C-alpha cells in the first residue's frame with residue numbers, strides 16, 4: 001500500500017520470468033529478456049519502446065506475440081519494471097557460438113559480454129530456453145536449471161525481516 005519489499009519483488013520477478021518463458025517455450029514463441037543488474041543498460045533501454053510497466057508473466061507473454069509491434073527485439077527489465085520492449089542489443093562476434101542458434105542468442109551473448117546483465121532466450125525454432133551471463137551461454141536448460149540460475153543470480157536477500165525500507 002506504500003512501498004514494497006525487495007525480497008518479494010525479486011521472487012515475483014523470477015516467477016514471472018519462469019511462467020512466461022515456459023508458456024512461450026511450449027508454443028515455440030521466440031523471446032529475449034535481459035535483466036539489468038549493477039551495469040547501466042540505460043543506452044539500450046532508450047532504443048526500445050518505453051513501457052515502465054509492472055512486471056507480470058501476462059504482460060511478458062503479450063509482448064512477444066509474433067507479428068506484433070512489441071515483439072521485434074529485447075525486453076529490458078530494470079529495477080522492478082519492464083522498462084522497454086523491442087530494444088536493440090549488440091550482437092556478439094564470437095565464432096564459438098554455434099551456427100544452429102539464432103540472432104536472439106547472438107544478441108543475448110553480445111549484451112552478456114559488456115554488462116553484468118542476465119539474459120533469457122526462448123528459441124522460435126525449438127522452444128529451448130537459454131541464458132547468458134558474462135560472455136557465457138547456458139544452452140537448452142531445464143526448468144529446474146533455469147529456476148536455480150535465476151534464484152542464484154537475481155535474489156540478493158536471504159530470510160530477513162520484511163520491510164518497505166530495506167531496498
Ligand SMILES: [Cl-]
Nearest residue numbers: 003004005008
Ligand atoms: Cl511488497
